[PDB]
Amino acid sequence: SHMSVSKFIKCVTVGDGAVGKTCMLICYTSNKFPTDYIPTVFDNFSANVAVDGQIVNLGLWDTAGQEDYSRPLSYRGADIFVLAFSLISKASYENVLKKWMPELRRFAPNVPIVLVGTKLDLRDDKGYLADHTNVITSTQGEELRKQIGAAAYIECSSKTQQNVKAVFDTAIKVVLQP
């Protein structure tokens, strides 16, 4: 053949501003956590990645909020969404229900979702835990996944790199498995 890679997968990352969408993408693609400048949106990025028996062409689309009441081009052609909220922001968790799930039901009804809790390094910090009465536990994260019908739930930290690869590996596997 003239093409050893025959599957393209468009993976769009969405969720509230400042939860860590862009850093996840920089972490996954570069194996580095940015310490100075972080762009609003990661460059549109595409690369071959090996998942199981396969090499696929992964296209990563980053997003940023807009005040737009027209009722997004970036969603067109999406095979899977990574829907991020921060493990230390209740508002971002509640916005998955109030903002993001409504948006995705309207604009991308049949597209699966990988639900991602970010900033695991903060949520799991014992100092943080000791001072907060009502923490977003893995249990609450799994309850959200269930409520929204997401394919998987993953907790990660771009800062320590924990489970970042798992996010996009799982996104790919959801698309490739039945």
Ligand X SMILES: Nc1nc2c(ncn2[C@@H]2O[C@H](COP(=O)(O)OP(=O)(O)O)[C@@H](O)[C@H]2O)c(=O)[nH]1
- 170 phi/psi in degrees, rounded to 5: -65, -40
Min. distance of Cβ 42 from Mg ion in angstroms?
7
Find which of Mg ion, ligand X, none residue 77 binds, CB within 5 to 8 Å per kind. none
Sheet of 152-155: strand order equals 45-50, 55-61, 8-14, 80-86, 113-118, 152-155
Q: How far is the CB of 100 from ligand X (least distance, A)?
A: 12
Taking CB under 6 A as the binding criterion, the range among 43-51, 98-106, 119-127, 147-155 that sits at the site for ligand X is: 119-127
Q: How many residues bind to Mg ion according to rule CB under 5 A? A: 2
**Contact of residue 50 among ligand X, Mg ion, none (CB under 5-8 Å per partner type):** none
Closest CA to 57 of 1, 13, 7: 7
Instruction: Give the list of residues 6+ apart from residue 120 with CB closer than 8 angstroms, or none.
Output: 87, 155, 156, 157, 160, 162, 163
Of the candidates 9, 12, 14, 19, which one interacts with ligand X according to CB under 6 A? 19
Could you give the 3-state DSSP secondary structure of residue 55? strand
Q: Is 16 annotated as a binding residue?
A: yes
Task: Determine which residue in the list 13, 22, 118, 163 makes contact with Mg ion, applying CB under 5 A.
Answer: 22
| Interface segment toward Mg ion; rule CB under 5 A; list 22-30, 74-82, 120-128, 149-157 | 22-30
Sign of the Cα pseudo-torsion (156, 159, 161, 167, in order):
positive
Which positions make up the binding site for GTP?
Answer: 15-22, 62-66, 118-121
